[PDB]
Amino acid sequence: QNVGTQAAEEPLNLPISVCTAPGNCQTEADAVVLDSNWRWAHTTTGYTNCYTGNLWDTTLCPTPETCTTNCAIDGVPLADWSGTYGGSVTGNKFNLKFVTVSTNIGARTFLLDSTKTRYRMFQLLNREFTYDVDVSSLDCGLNGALYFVSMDADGGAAKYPTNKGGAKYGTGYCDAQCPHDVKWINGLANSKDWTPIPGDANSGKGYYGNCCAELDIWEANKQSQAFTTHPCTPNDQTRCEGVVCGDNDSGDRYNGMCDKDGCDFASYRMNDHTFYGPGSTFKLDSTKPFTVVSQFITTDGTDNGDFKEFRRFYVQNGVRIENSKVNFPGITAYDSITDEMCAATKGLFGDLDDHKNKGGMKQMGEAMRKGMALVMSIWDDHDVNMLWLDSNYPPTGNPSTPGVARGPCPTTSGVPSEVEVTQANAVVSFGNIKFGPIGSTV
């Protein structure tokens, strides 16, 4: 995309901590940038929309190349962050409102480095990543997500010279779902064969998808939470078409370059329904804030080893809370993501181990070694109504069959039109982000 001249781009300042030992950290003066999908797209030498509602203008965008020549994405000024997009920062806390009323629904954002010209790339192997979260106002159907993806640090600017904005304009998004709803891919409008998504007034799908590796630290609302590894072959940003995208709609979910299911550790799905929930007698009380700690263990305990284990623990009101465990007869009580856990649990659930097909923890680790961009988002789910996270999936499945039940939400929950009314004022908060060696962040 070209860059427009109507509004300066002003990312929100967000300090994080880089740590060397427990309680010995230094501030890193980073910032938050809005994903290019949420930006106004208009004519390069005017005010005329190139995209309105869920459609590209066919006169301006008869082809992707012409669209890209004629159109530009514009900046987010400071005033518009809260007023238009529902984003705000107080000290080291970042807040994202779900619906902001001209009416904005959801948000996806990235962490910029201290220069505000590149994404802050995190080399996560043999490191610990930690943050405080509040998901108390997110119920069934919503997801306040924090995760990493194998985006380029410059959003693709060096690879795709028609991308003028780079990381500064939140470009280059890709993930392990190979999404077609990304409006700008490889420096070009994804306007070919663009199709609105029914019941989604703001979104559509273009000819291409954009694939890359994804490490989900946090997919969650107050009812259920998960962390998940998604390797791809290769891991780096890859525009896809046809079978390579692994499109759900053509029966290709397991035929593409990315592991779409991922290998998940989701406490409720692993059959501990009392670990996490909205109340003081759950082990971890989702009505109150808490700290989420993630440790990425290698084979030799060094930065050069292969990724072998994703460990997790929590801190809430000064109380250390170890992760829940897998709880099925004849299955080891795993409390972390490893290749063995993935094989054993997917075996039990009858899920295809595409994680293993894509190179497993080792391949996931190669993405983490090269460095990944931090994503913070809030969203509802127009495909599957978040049932995969917090309900029975498939909805018609027996909840006593291992793998089906992922949370207590009813299978009628999560319809975007309903959650966008009922949960309009939901806000996820991510704060006090800390990064360092294992054992350094609490």
Short mmCIF file of N, CA and C in Angstrom, two decimals, residues 129 148 215-218 226-229 263 265 292-297 307-313 323 335-338 341 361 364 368:
data_model
loop_
_atom_site.label_atom_id
_atom_site.label_comp_id
_atom_site.label_asym_id
_atom_site.label_seq_id
_atom_site.Cartn_x
_atom_site.Cartn_y
_atom_site.Cartn_z
N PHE A 129 8.48 -14.91 28.74
CA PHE A 129 7.65 -13.78 28.37
C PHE A 129 6.45 -13.75 29.30
N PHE A 148 2.19 -14.37 19.05
CA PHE A 148 3.32 -14.00 18.20
C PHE A 148 3.11 -14.59 16.82
N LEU A 215 2.56 -18.46 17.39
CA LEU A 215 2.69 -18.97 18.75
C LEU A 215 1.65 -18.25 19.59
N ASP A 216 0.60 -18.96 19.97
CA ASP A 216 -0.50 -18.37 20.73
C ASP A 216 -0.20 -18.47 22.21
N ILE A 217 0.12 -17.33 22.81
CA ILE A 217 0.34 -17.26 24.25
C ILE A 217 -1.00 -17.32 24.98
N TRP A 218 -2.02 -16.70 24.39
CA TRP A 218 -3.24 -16.40 25.11
C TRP A 218 -4.41 -16.23 24.13
N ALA A 226 -6.51 -20.84 26.36
CA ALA A 226 -5.63 -21.80 25.71
C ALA A 226 -4.33 -21.16 25.29
N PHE A 227 -3.30 -21.98 25.20
CA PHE A 227 -2.04 -21.63 24.55
C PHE A 227 -1.68 -22.74 23.59
N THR A 228 -1.12 -22.35 22.44
CA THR A 228 -1.08 -23.20 21.26
C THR A 228 0.10 -22.87 20.34
N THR A 229 0.75 -23.91 19.82
CA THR A 229 1.83 -23.78 18.86
C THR A 229 1.30 -24.10 17.47
N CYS A 263 -1.02 -27.30 18.17
CA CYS A 263 -1.03 -28.15 19.36
C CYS A 263 -1.37 -27.27 20.55
N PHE A 265 -2.68 -26.49 24.53
CA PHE A 265 -2.96 -26.81 25.91
C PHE A 265 -4.02 -25.83 26.39
N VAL A 292 0.44 -13.90 33.59
CA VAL A 292 0.61 -15.08 32.75
C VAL A 292 2.10 -15.20 32.39
N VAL A 293 2.74 -16.30 32.80
CA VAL A 293 4.17 -16.50 32.58
C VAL A 293 4.38 -17.65 31.62
N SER A 294 5.20 -17.43 30.58
CA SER A 294 5.44 -18.44 29.56
C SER A 294 6.95 -18.63 29.43
N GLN A 295 7.41 -19.88 29.48
CA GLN A 295 8.83 -20.22 29.42
C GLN A 295 9.05 -21.16 28.24
N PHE A 296 10.05 -20.85 27.41
CA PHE A 296 10.29 -21.59 26.18
C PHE A 296 11.60 -22.34 26.31
N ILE A 297 11.48 -23.63 26.63
CA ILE A 297 12.61 -24.45 27.06
C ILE A 297 13.21 -25.11 25.82
N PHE A 307 13.63 -26.04 20.26
CA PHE A 307 12.47 -25.83 21.15
C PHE A 307 11.92 -27.20 21.55
N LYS A 308 11.79 -27.45 22.85
CA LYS A 308 11.26 -28.72 23.35
C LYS A 308 10.00 -28.62 24.22
N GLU A 309 9.80 -27.49 24.90
CA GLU A 309 8.70 -27.38 25.85
C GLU A 309 8.24 -25.95 26.08
N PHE A 310 6.92 -25.76 26.02
CA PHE A 310 6.27 -24.50 26.37
C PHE A 310 5.67 -24.73 27.75
N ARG A 311 6.30 -24.13 28.77
CA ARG A 311 5.81 -24.18 30.16
C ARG A 311 5.02 -22.92 30.50
N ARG A 312 4.13 -23.05 31.49
CA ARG A 312 3.18 -22.01 31.85
C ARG A 312 2.96 -22.02 33.35
N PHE A 313 2.97 -20.85 33.97
CA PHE A 313 2.38 -20.69 35.29
C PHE A 313 1.78 -19.31 35.43
N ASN A 323 0.50 -24.65 36.29
CA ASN A 323 -0.48 -24.96 35.26
C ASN A 323 -1.29 -26.19 35.66
N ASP A 335 1.59 -31.04 31.75
CA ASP A 335 1.22 -29.67 32.11
C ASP A 335 1.89 -28.61 31.25
N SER A 336 2.31 -29.03 30.06
CA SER A 336 3.05 -28.17 29.15
C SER A 336 2.87 -28.71 27.74
N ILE A 337 3.27 -27.91 26.76
CA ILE A 337 3.31 -28.39 25.38
C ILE A 337 4.67 -29.00 25.07
N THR A 338 4.65 -30.27 24.66
CA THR A 338 5.79 -31.00 24.11
C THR A 338 5.29 -31.83 22.93
N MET A 341 3.25 -34.77 24.33
CA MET A 341 1.91 -34.33 24.76
C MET A 341 0.98 -34.17 23.56
N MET A 361 7.58 -29.23 17.50
CA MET A 361 8.18 -28.22 18.36
C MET A 361 9.47 -27.67 17.75
N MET A 364 8.49 -25.10 15.15
CA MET A 364 7.96 -23.95 15.87
C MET A 364 9.11 -23.12 16.42
N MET A 368 10.68 -19.06 16.24
CA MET A 368 10.98 -18.33 17.46
C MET A 368 12.43 -17.85 17.51
#
